[PDB]
Ligand binder design. Structure first.
Ligand SMILES: CC[C@@H]1/C=C(\C)[C@@H](O)[C@H](C)C[C@H](OC)[C@H]2O[C@@](O)(C(=O)C(=O)N3CCCC[C@H]3C(=O)O[C@H](/C(C)=C/[C@@H]3CC[C@@H](O)[C@H](OC)C3)[C@H](C)[C@@H](O)CC1=O)[C@H](C)C[C@@H]2OC
Length: 107
């Protein structure tokens, strides 16, 4: 599944609902620590809509647990990420992933 470990607290009140757009910054790394992506390096917040099957299960369920302003470490088992398939040339098969995610606002 997905573990959510808080880095910095959010408001504890405003949680994303199905049909709302989450605006986040994130960094993604493999379990061994190798960074593979960062919206911060891209200098553009990442947007996705909850309930629209847009993101890996670990995100769909992990970000749902966050409130606006919260920064958290999401540790995600391969089955809640890219599984045995992986993501060609980025995510190897059977990868546990770690995301640093900050929920900036809802739209
Ligand atoms: C068509 C291009 C389209 C690309 C964009 C909109 C880009 O602008 C984004 C900024 C994405 C990044 O582009 C540089 C890049 O992000 C990663 O690096 C990454 O950090 C990641 O893991 N993310 C992104 C942040 C949210 C969680 C997760 C994800 O869920 O991503 C989603 C994802 C890949 C879902 C799979 C869909 C197929 C299912 O079969 C599989 O089911 C297991 C899940 C992603 C947002 C898709 O909805 C949309 C796209 O892929 C991926 C390793 C590879 C991906 O590039 C492709």
């Amino acid at each position: 599944g997905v573990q959510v470990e808080t880095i910095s607290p959010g408001d504890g009140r405003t949680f994303p609902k199905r049909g709302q757009t989450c605006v986040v910054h994130y960094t993604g790394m493999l379990e061994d620590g190798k960074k593979f992506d960062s919206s911060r390096d891209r200098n553009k917040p990442f947007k996705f809509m909850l309930g629209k099957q847009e993101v890996i299960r670990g995100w769909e369920e992990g970000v749902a647990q966050m409130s606006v302003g919260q920064r958290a470490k999401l540790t995600i088992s391969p089955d809640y990420a890219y599984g045995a398939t992986g993501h060609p040339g980025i995510i190897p098969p059977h990868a546990t992933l770690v995301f640093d995610v900050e929920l900036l606002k809802l739209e």
